[PDB]
Design a protein around this ligand. Structure first.
Ligand SMILES: *[C@@H]1O[C@H](CO)[C@@H](O[C@@H]2O[C@H](CO)[C@@H](O[C@@H]3O[C@H](CO)[C@@H](O)[C@H](O)[C@@H]3O)[C@H](O)[C@H]2NC(C)=O)[C@H](O)[C@H]1NC(C)=O
Ligand SMILES: *[C@@H]1O[C@H](CO)[C@@H](O[C@@H]2O[C@H](CO)[C@@H](O[C@@H]3O[C@H](CO)[C@@H](O)[C@H](O)[C@@H]3O)[C@H](O)[C@H]2NC(C)=O)[C@H](O)[C@H]1NC(C)=O
Ligand SMILES: *[C@@H]1O[C@H](CO)[C@@H](O[C@@H]2O[C@H](CO)[C@@H](O[C@@H]3O[C@H](CO)[C@@H](O)[C@H](O)[C@@H]3O)[C@H](O)[C@H]2NC(C)=O)[C@H](O)[C@H]1NC(C)=O
Ligand SMILES: CO[C@]1(C(=O)O)C[C@H](O)[C@@H](NC(C)=O)[C@H]([C@H](O)[C@H](O)CO)O1
Ligand SMILES: CO[C@]1(C(=O)O)C[C@H](O)[C@@H](NC(C)=O)[C@H]([C@H](O)[C@H](O)CO)O1
Ligand SMILES: CO[C@]1(C(=O)O)C[C@H](O)[C@@H](NC(C)=O)[C@H]([C@H](O)[C@H](O)CO)O1
Ligand SMILES: CO[C@]1(C(=O)O)C[C@H](O)[C@@H](NC(C)=O)[C@H]([C@H](O)[C@H](O)CO)O1
Ligand SMILES: CO[C@]1(C(=O)O)C[C@H](O)[C@@H](NC(C)=O)[C@H]([C@H](O)[C@H](O)CO)O1
Ligand SMILES: CO[C@]1(C(=O)O)C[C@H](O)[C@@H](NC(C)=O)[C@H]([C@H](O)[C@H](O)CO)O1
Ligand SMILES: *[C@@H]1O[C@H](CO)[C@@H](O)[C@H](O)[C@H]1NC(C)=O
Ligand SMILES: *[C@@H]1O[C@H](CO)[C@@H](O)[C@H](O)[C@H]1NC(C)=O
Ligand SMILES: *[C@@H]1O[C@H](CO)[C@@H](O)[C@H](O)[C@H]1NC(C)=O
Ligand SMILES: *[C@@H]1O[C@H](CO)[C@@H](O)[C@H](O)[C@H]1NC(C)=O
Ligand SMILES: *[C@@H]1O[C@H](CO)[C@@H](O)[C@H](O)[C@H]1NC(C)=O
Ligand SMILES: *[C@@H]1O[C@H](CO)[C@@H](O)[C@H](O)[C@H]1NC(C)=O
Ligand SMILES: *[C@@H]1O[C@H](CO)[C@@H](O)[C@H](O)[C@H]1NC(C)=O
Ligand SMILES: *[C@@H]1O[C@H](CO)[C@@H](O)[C@H](O)[C@H]1NC(C)=O
Ligand SMILES: *[C@@H]1O[C@H](CO)[C@@H](O)[C@H](O)[C@H]1NC(C)=O
Ligand SMILES: *[C@@H]1O[C@H](CO)[C@@H](O)[C@H](O)[C@H]1NC(C)=O
Ligand SMILES: *[C@@H]1O[C@H](CO)[C@@H](O)[C@H](O)[C@H]1NC(C)=O
Ligand SMILES: *[C@@H]1O[C@H](CO)[C@@H](O)[C@H](O)[C@H]1NC(C)=O
Lengths: 328, 175, 328, 175, 328, 175
């Protein structure tokens, strides 16, 4: 074939792989620190500190909780008919109207918070034989006395409080949320002065349900000059059903209905600053990037967020084992 | 790892190789040389990206959930709210921890595999013309100039061309 | 050996593996579509559309909810003493007797639904001084007025409704569920006509518990000619304990006890047809085969069922990688 | 996969092989022939069934549970009912998705392994009488008729019988 | 080179691995019984049967439930101001004082159980116009009549029970838990004999909340000679807030406050013997060693415990496959 | 397992080897002997301990939780309490069962790997002087006394010392 290759020598070929001077330690099935060429972090552990105002509709509650925005505390009149994807409540919020309590505050806050709208429709209730629009100096609206914008305090007319028995049909094709309440007097004297009967009673019903609440007289702690209280209740009325309000004293009546919807709204307690940026994931600590699969910033989240994990770092190896050639 | 090439029969990596993950260093009639192997580098890189992309697959989104912070003491219902969340967090934390362990263990065996595959592939190609020195280097028993080393690297080496030269050099000698 | 074995020929032997023209794509740790020779589906995604009536005991509620079957709506008298592994309630069910409400409807439905029996034992309660067996035209039993078969409406006798104070010992070795209730009149007039006292009261107690409910007068929405309502309550009496019913007006009294048991019974809302076949897993969409480990048919299941998963397909590779030899 | 035989040094599969998963094609004195290897076919099949049967192991049964569909709005307790179920479903969904990923990845490496094991086993048996052509075929350096090919296949090949014929044919030649 | 001199021969070297005569079966991805050289158990399935009294502070309730220890049943006076990491309640516990009921027994037990202290501070409430320290023969303290040590039964003085209206400020920097209650008479006669008014009323409030409970007259089952009952209620008062107790009859008044804390305390029902040993994990079946990662002893645990698993054995292979020389 | 050495080309284990997990048996002109290989024994042992220690890593501690045993029938809230716990237990039970499956499968392939690595390592060291009999034994084609067998075992064997003796014995013969 070929002729005399006078020289017959050899060659050496060595296969091998890279190594890096630096390198990163990662956990394994068999080791918990083994050094690889490179790795990537899968736990997001820092927030920007600011709630980005985009893409969800953030409504800053300023110094209103959602329930005071709902009831219509004078200072919260700014939120009438407002809407949100996320309502942010602030630690600085305060109520500043008639002292009230809400038996299941936690469910009414939830229920409005995910409906996502404070859209109110006033309805033509006719209260015959009682004085409408009562107010208090603890709920100052402007210079004068006032009360919650969405409720109507009824007191006697002259020398009588009749048995009110009114009805409002749900003729539309959506559910109607009605907020109403009852006034708890401090003294039996107060009771008879305002509502004549020495024992009031409120019964609010639909074809499906009924609540009867009787007021409770007694002194509570002075709050804004008052020892009386009003407790708030709610009734959802389905399409085709009918609300019947029947009372004989102490009724704080509804002025109409909030309309309910179904969506992705929720509420979040946070003093983080809202800022202009687009971020999908919101944490009470501020928005965080959802590029990584897990996060350790907060177990409270809203939006497309990484799954909260107790670990603050988890490195995924993206390279071979680092076996360098120098000493250390 | 499972194949014993990386941090195995190949004693250590080359910090100098900056152009790829796996490769060749050779010394022949024409001098010395180094060169990355881009096919196996791409093979290892593509699998590690594939793996990576599956793990960055969709954060699912959640909107109204349950309260997870409370300021008053309530008892039964609040204990359950807290217990639902704490068992959810430990289960997801266990998942994250096992996922990176399995994943990392596999990435080390996978890259070990590719090393060993390139070695086997070069072995097979040299046929009766080279012997394995056992440290990831082959001793080629025939004159192999730079173009020869380039044909082993780009996979076109014809062993037949050098088989008699090699077999002579390799065996005959004096025993 | 032989002698000069001269035949210098060679042979070629090639090892290899099969390949299929078709092939199936499956997900991997490193790829999300890689083609294998064959795979098998692990998500069950289709129902038969029919609830198989075997092996569990399906009781079709027809147009009765379980609570109306329990209380004894005339139209549901069919279910007296009935039993079930799964009670199926239908969207068409309707109540057709005295308008009632059940304060924790959801727990009473649960509690009866998993007891699995409507077995009723009539007990010898003696109501002295009141008229028994009151009925209403809104609960027509046959041509006449009627009421729930399992409850006993007591009204005045002549000019008096005494303080009823009766007792019933649990002397057996099982728990006794008692269903009782109270009648809420529309008017104070109605109250005094029926129960004489202007304010009724029902107190039902055991050594372990007590409930006192006072009725609530007021008009509710006209339902079957009525604005009155009755609310339903329940008391479980343990072996060795004793029931004491004490009332002074408005009591809808128990006629005995339902007996309670412990088993695998539950209830399911479904309009699926019950059919004759044997299937272990029931979904409101109909039975589904539990051969696969996961299912995407419905998160509501009863019986031995696959785990509900959001995925609708998950293919498990059952063959090597498909590397075809051309593809035909 | 990890061993680099399937879709590796063995370029592609044989759609023609209908009688088993792994096997031999030969070209010899009497012509060309194909034949499935049933031991490795059964080895791969048994492991994939074993794996399969563990995954079809017992659907556990559940009876009265919690309500998962509601028609009225209730707030706190209903939000928790919904949140318990939704976090249960996402956890089981994560489980199903990771289970088939691990499983499938393993089935590909396992079947790759069996291919490579049959190759190694045949290599070892031919001893000094054949050389690896590097694409999963051996070149047998001696006259091997159909009974000879059947003894390699059924594992009774005696290399010694042909060792001098082979060593002559393989080396001596002219170098 | 090396010069053989004379000998001509070969050698045989065989590589291999150990095997053991015995061996253990373990589960795998592909097999569910494969035999390995050795394995280790990961499910802890046995208890010692005794609750080790170290390192947590176990308080054995003997024959007191935590609520009776809290209220001050005479027989439980042993526990006054006691503290615990784990309160163990025994099946033998019994109450032996005035028949009472607690509307949300389950939350009050929880709330005290994790506060971990029964530390009580007596406060200077002044009840003017009523007789203090009422007791009953059903709560014998020593030879005489008695009542719960931490509560104060007020009855009329002479011919009057005034409207009590008292207040107690939370001026300290911690929350105060107040336990109070109301007495439900058996007869209207009993009502007027003790509290003069034919209808009592208790209103307990803070700036944040209010409860008004009205008593309920009627006979309950004879328990320790009595058909009357008292129901227990609780009010937590935050730093800076103020308690106002206002009543007009039937009040069982607080004598001061329990102080609340936050820690790792909990309660456990168990008849296991407490013994002297150190164990971190407690199960109602007794302590168990937390060396293994999973346990099948009980789903109820306290402390550093293995995760409860339905499996009772899970063997982790710690050795290669066992392929023996003869058999197995 | 994946490498096919254990319960593979190495027919069975040696119950007699009590001094280590992997090792050698030889028969030369001086005698026969057995000896454990401590490097691979330690390699397999260290990985199995590493694996073991990660699994015995921290039982987390929990204090006040929710009630899990009830004596009266309550309905809605008690059904949820029971359903939170039962779904927690099934999820943790699934986790324990999958964890020991993956783990055990890996421990068998890992120990199989080490067996095969020791084999490969010994193969490489003997170079042209030995042939693989295919059952995990090499046939050394030169006189190898007990010190010679010790040098293969302790890794200091010099193949060059015996290469002409071996190549003669191995090939030349008469073909
Ligand atoms: C029932 O008892 C409570 C508690 O003793 C009485 O409440 C206290 O009533 C006085 C007089 O109205 C309140 O005085 C007010 O103090 C504020 C400063 O905080 C001052 O600005 C007002 O002008 C007024 O002087 C006191 O705050 C209030 N304390 C509490 C804790 O509520 C209540 O008056 C008693 N009711 C009856 C009918 O006896
Ligand atoms: C309190 O106010 C409510 C609401 O206005 C009154 O309810 C209504 O009462 C009338 C007279 O009984 C009911 O009329 C009947 O309706 C049916 C169906 O249309 C019809 O068949 C009868 O011929 C009659 O018209 C009406 O349905 C009912 N509406 C509602 C929503 O309940 C109630 O009577 C008032 N009560 C008192 C004591 O003032
Ligand atoms: C209302 O009805 C209930 C049930 O009939 C009456 O309860 C029972 O009352 C009697 C008389 O006080 C109790 O008797 C006593 O029992 C003890 C234990 O055996 C014994 O030492 C006494 O000598 C006497 O026999 C009986 O236990 C009690 N039973 C129950 C279940 O509570 C109640 O008295 C009635 N009340 C009125 C005002 O009519
Ligand atoms: C203290 O004086 C006031 C007040 O609140 O300013 C005056 C106010 O016009 C009056 N409003 C009505 C409708 O009567 C209100 C109630 O009497 C009191 O809130 C009952 O609790 O009391
Ligand atoms: C009214 O009492 C509660 C409630 O909602 O039931 C108690 C609850 O512990 C508290 N939670 C926190 C984190 O503060 C909450 C908020 O104050 C309120 O929701 C603000 O809207 O108030
Ligand atoms: C409207 O007439 C009826 C009715 O329902 O048919 C007549 C019926 O005999 C009467 N039953 C009794 C026991 O009195 C009932 C009640 O008075 C009414 O339901 C109170 O709500 O009213
Ligand atoms: C009475 O109100 C409720 C209840 O049970 O509390 C409300 C609940 O949202 C609704 N759920 C659904 C899916 O419709 C349920 C059924 O109508 C009822 O259980 C049929 O038995 O009724
Ligand atoms: C039955 O006689 C007693 C008792 O219990 O021993 C006498 C006891 O001195 C008396 N205590 C007071 C403060 O009046 C008590 C109540 O009258 C009774 O418990 C009301 O339920 O009744
Ligand atoms: C008062 O009723 C209850 C409660 O706490 O609500 C009912 C509950 O089913 C029961 N649980 C068990 C396991 O027995 C519990 C204990 O008896 C009590 O907590 C002992 O402290 O009592
Ligand atoms: C390390 O890995 C990440 C993810 O694969 C990659 O973006 C990064 O560039 C890698 N680092 C280097 C130096 O290649
Ligand atoms: C709120 O929206 C309703 C519906 O359009 C409207 O009629 C009402 O007047 C609005 N009120 C305010 C204050 O915006
Ligand atoms: C996020 O917020 C919580 C509560 O506000 C805090 O404890 C936590 O440490 C914060 N973490 C980060 C990364 O901001
Ligand atoms: C391989 O290398 C030789 C020498 O450089 C060259 O002639 C040949 O064309 C190369 N082939 C490829 C595919 O690069
Ligand atoms: C595909 O896999 C399933 C499960 O192993 C099996 O039943 C089916 O027969 C396989 N298909 C073929 C063509 O072998
Ligand atoms: C229901 O079963 C009980 C118990 O045997 C029986 O006494 C009662 O009469 C039965 N009633 C009906 C309607 O079946
Ligand atoms: C099952 O039923 C639910 C609700 O009825 C429906 O949304 C779902 O799509 C159905 N799925 C199947 C496979 O029938
Ligand atoms: C192997 O093949 C040869 C030729 O067909 C035959 O003689 C021999 O007996 C076969 N052995 C086995 C075990 O099949
Ligand atoms: C079996 O494994 C366990 C855990 O590795 C170990 O403690 C034990 O000693 C092993 N048994 C033997 C005989 O080595
Ligand atoms: C309980 O502790 C408080 C606080 O030191 C003390 O004043 C009180 O007297 C103690 N009472 C008893 C019975 O130990
Ligand atoms: C632990 O206790 C429970 C309930 O007391 C019992 O059913 C279980 O079998 C016990 N298990 C052990 C290992 O003691
Ligand atoms: C290896 O074995 C030979 C013969 O026993 C001995 O001389 C040599 O020093 C040994 N080397 C080591 C590192 O043990």
């Amino acid at each position: 074939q070929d002729l005399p290759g006078n020289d017959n020598s050899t060659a050496t070929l060595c296969l091998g792989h890279h190594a890096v001077p630096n390198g990163t330690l990662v956990k394994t099935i068999t080791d918990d620190q083994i050094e690889v060429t490179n790795a990537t972090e899968l736990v997001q552990s820092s927030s920007t500190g600011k709630i980005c105002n985009n893409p969800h509709r953030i409504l800053d509650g300023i110094d209103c909780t959602l329930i005071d925005a709902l009831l219509g505390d004078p200072h919260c009149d700014v939120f009438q008919n407002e809407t949100w994807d996320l309502f942010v409540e602030r630690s600085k919020a305060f109520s500043n109207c008639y002292p009230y309590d809400v038996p299941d505050y936690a469910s009414l806050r939830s229920l409005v918070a995910s409906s996502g709208t404070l859209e109110f429709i006033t309805e033509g209730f006719t209260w015959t034989g009682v004085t409408q629009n009562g107010g208090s100096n603890a709920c100052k609206r402007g210079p004068g006395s006032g009360f919650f914008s969405r409720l109507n305090w009824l007191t006697k007319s002259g020398s009588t409080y009749p048995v009110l028995n009114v009805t409002m049909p749900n003729n539309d094709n959506f559910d109607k949320l009605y907020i109403w309440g009852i006034h708890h007097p401090s003294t039996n004297q107060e009771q008879t002065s305002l509502y004549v009967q020495a024992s009031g009673r409120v019964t609010v019903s639909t074809r499906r349900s009924q609540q009867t609440i009787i007021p409770n007289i007694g002194s509570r702690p002075w709050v804004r000059g008052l020892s009386s209280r009003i407790s708030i209740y709610w009734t959802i009325v389905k399409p085709g059903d009918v609300l019947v309000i029947n009372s004989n004293g102490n009724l704080i009546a509804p002025r109409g209905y909030f309309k309910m919807r179904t969506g992705k709204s929720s509420i979040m307690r946070s003093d983080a600053p809202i800022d202009t940026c687009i971020s999908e994931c919101i944490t009470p600590n501020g928005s965080i990037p959802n590029d990584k699969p897990f996060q350790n910033v907060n177990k409270i989240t809203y939006g497309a967020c990484p799954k909260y994990v107790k670990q603050n770092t988890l490195k995924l190896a993206t390279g071979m084992r680092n076996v360098p050639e120098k000493q250390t | 790892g499972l194949f014993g090439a990386i941090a195995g029969f190949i004693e250590n990596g080359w910090e100098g190789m900056i152009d790829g993950w796996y490769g060749f260093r050779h010394q022949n009639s024409e001098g010395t040389g180094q060169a990355a192997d881009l096919k196996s580098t791409q093979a290892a890189i593509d699998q590690i990206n594939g793996k990576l992309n599956r793990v960055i697959e969709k954060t699912n989104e959640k909107f109204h959930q349950i309260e997870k912070e409370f300021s008053e003491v309530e008892g039964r219902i609040q204990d359950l709210e807290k217990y639902v969340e704490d068992t959810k967090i430990d289960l997801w934390s266990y998942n994250a921890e096992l996922l990176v362990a399995l994943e990392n263990q596999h990435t080390i065996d996978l890259t070990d595999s590719e090393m060993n595959k390139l070695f086997e592939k070069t072995r097979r190609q040299l046929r009766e013309n080279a012997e394995e020195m056992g440290n990831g280097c082959f001793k080629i028993y025939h004159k192999c100039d730079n173009a020869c080393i380039e044909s082993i690297r780009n996979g076109t080496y014809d062993h037949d061309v050098y088989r008699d030269e090699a077999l002579n050099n390799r065996f005959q000698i004096k025993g």
